[PDB]
Amino acid sequence: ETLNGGITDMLTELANFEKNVSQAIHKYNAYRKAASVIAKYPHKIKSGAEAKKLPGVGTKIAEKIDEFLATGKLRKLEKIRQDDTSSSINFLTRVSGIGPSAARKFVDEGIKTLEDLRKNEDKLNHHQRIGLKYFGDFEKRIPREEMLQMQDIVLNEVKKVDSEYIATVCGSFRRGAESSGDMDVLLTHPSFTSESTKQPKLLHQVVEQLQKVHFITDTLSKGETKFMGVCQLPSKNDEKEYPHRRIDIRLIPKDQYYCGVLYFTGSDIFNKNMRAHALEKGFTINEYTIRPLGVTGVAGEPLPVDSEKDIFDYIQWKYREPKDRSE
DNA sequence: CATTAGA
DNA sequence: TCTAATG
Ligand code: NA
Ligand code: NA
């Protein structure tokens, strides 16, 4: 956690590189298992060799470790950090919709800069066009102050269209967080569950609403269960307009909300731990359900959940407010 | 790890 | 169809 930091950190630097700049899934996959293990290791790694004793720790990595252990640097790390080509990939990737594949192709063409990107909006698809359009806006954090306003709004439409609609604003926001990145609305409705062969309009109606009013300014992708877009707070009695925010809404079968809702709310650790727990308590939890455990090794049978509580009860825990879902 | 675009 | 990019 701190005794092995530089190593694990240099390591992930290295891995992340091979995966992005190069197309070395393997090497990249290497650095990470290694970075994983040394991370675990209970002691100040004193030399490559000591490291080396490790599972996943070959001679390549060991070698790197020593150089780093001796000199607070690495050449390959220094070189990479400089490398414009590679610097460029790392950067283009920030554009929502730009991935590494694209990040490289772009380069190979010579689109290294943001401006490059503009001169060739043509070479870009709608996703990436939007990514570029709201570049500043997409990187900025979401004041919970604004979050509250946003939420107030969707809750208003959802209800307005059908009173039957259930919507939860999951995430860190949910967990009380001061700021957030993007809004995440978990959606569901009674007339939609596990079996009852969809009702796509169910999602659709709402999006239409939210646009209708100008909350949703754009569509990144909208499918029959998952919409991906952009929203915006009505820029008041002017002088101050609002930033374009990322927003994501998802239709859920009523019979899987709470697990889902449980889940998206997190935190990443609260989950595992909660998950690890259900396990002892003779269970299994995952993004949609909770099934009692059978001793034959495994077992099925989806337990019935009417709220975040049922799930707690089941595995018999203390109801933990989203506030304290930290870990 | 599953859902959407796109080509 | 596969392959990408997001969460
Ligand atoms: Na070893
Ligand atoms: Na990106």
Side-chain angles (χ1 to χ4, degrees):
Chain A
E1 282 174 288
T2 223
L3 65 180
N4 302 149
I7 310 188
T8 54
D9 302 322
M10 133 222 260
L11 254 48
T12 45
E13 268 216 3
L14 253 332
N16 256 312
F17 163 91
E18 300 281 349
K19 128 79 179 229
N20 293 159
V21 174
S22 17
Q23 192 168 102
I25 158 92
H26 289 320
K27 278 179 202 175
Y28 147 84
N29 232 151
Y31 277 131
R32 73 151 317 181
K33 95 313 181 198
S36 163
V37 319
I38 81 134
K40 292 197 181 145
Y41 185 71
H43 306 294
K44 261 220 156 59
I45 293 148
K46 252 62 170 274
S47 49
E50 186 197 327
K52 173 134 219 212
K53 316 192 133 313
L54 277 37
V57 338
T59 143
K60 264 144 313 94
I61 294 152
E63 182 133 13
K64 280 151 251 218
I65 297 179
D66 285 324
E67 175 185 356
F68 168 107
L69 280 34
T71 98
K73 267 259 218 151
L74 193 62
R75 151 152 167 184
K76 210 177 174 152
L77 224 40
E78 67 180 14
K79 171 181 173 155
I80 280 189
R81 200 277 132 155
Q82 284 154 203
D83 195 48
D84 109 272
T85 264
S86 148
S87 283
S88 300
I89 293 167
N90 292 121
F91 179 94
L92 260 21
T93 253
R94 290 158 51 187
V95 186
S96 212
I98 284 174
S101 168
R104 321 175 220 160
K105 146 204 152 198
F106 270 135
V107 161
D108 297 299
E109 285 181 326
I111 326 269
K112 300 183 188 160
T113 132
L114 192 145
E115 297 207 50
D116 293 3
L117 264 176
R118 305 178 152 127
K119 315 311 294 168
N120 314 243
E121 215 170 306
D122 75 294
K123 304 209 136 62
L124 300 175
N125 84 245
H126 192 58
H127 189 155
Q128 326 186 126
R129 292 208 188 140
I130 300 207
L132 170 73
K133 186 148 149 261
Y134 302 137
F135 191 100
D137 307 11
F138 287 171
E139 288 206 320
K140 309 199 203 101
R141 287 297 305 186
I142 313 172
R144 151 162 265 249
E145 347 295 307
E146 303 183 336
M147 273 301 220
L148 296 168
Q149 55 197 104
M150 275 174 305
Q151 161 177 260
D152 167 65
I153 328 218
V154 185
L155 296 207
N156 288 352
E157 307 310 98
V158 142
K159 156 152 184 155
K160 56 196 288 256
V161 31
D162 176 345
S163 167
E164 222 80 50
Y165 275 126
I166 295 220
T168 301
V169 179
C170 309
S172 39
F173 162 68
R174 202 143 160 295
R175 289 176 312 175
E178 277 295 319
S179 49
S180 317
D182 57 349
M183 128 150 317
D184 201 353
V185 199
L186 250 31
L187 200 66
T188 194
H189 185 242
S191 127
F192 175 70
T193 151
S194 271
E195 316 94 18
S196 62
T197 208
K198 316 277 203 200
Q199 211 189 7
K201 280 307 165 198
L202 271 187
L203 179 35
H204 296 210
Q205 268 158 181
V206 322
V207 177
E208 215 164 41
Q209 198 29 220
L210 301 23
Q211 264 151 318
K212 186 196 158 182
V213 322
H214 312 303
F215 183 60
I216 293 176
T217 35
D218 337 54
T219 309
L220 244 31
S221 92
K222 183 231 330 264
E224 74 208 328
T225 46
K226 188 201 229 179
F227 161 85
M228 246 142 54
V230 180
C231 58
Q232 207 204 38
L233 294 166
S235 313
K236 316 270 192 183
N237 20 170
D238 266 5
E239 280 283 11
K240 75 284 273 283
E241 157 150 312
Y242 274 98
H244 282 80
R245 277 107 187 23
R246 280 283 305 99
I247 191 205
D248 293 356
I249 321 172
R250 33 226 317 176
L251 209 32
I252 302 285
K254 157 103 214 229
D255 84 314
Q256 34 177 228
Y257 208 61
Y258 310 116
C259 291
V261 153
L262 190 22
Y263 173 78
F264 265 123
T265 298
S267 72
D268 285 349
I269 64 285
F270 170 49
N271 277 164
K272 303 182 161 182
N273 274 105
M274 174 148 77
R275 288 174 163 213
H277 181 87
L279 233 326
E280 299 330 287
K281 299 327 157 106
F283 291 119
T284 198
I285 344 283
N286 70 151
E287 40 296 51
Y288 318 119
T289 59
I290 191 196
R291 301 165 315 177
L293 247 16
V295 65
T296 80
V298 320
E301 277 24 41
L303 275 25
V305 171
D306 252 66
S307 178
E308 292 210 291
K309 169 61 156 169
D310 285 304
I311 285 180
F312 283 103
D313 279 351
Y314 278 17
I315 52 160
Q316 55 208 150
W317 233 15
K318 67 149 129 186
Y319 190 167
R320 339 196 70 213
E321 268 224 336
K323 142 209 255 280
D324 73 56
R325 302 279 196 97
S326 296
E327 63 127 13

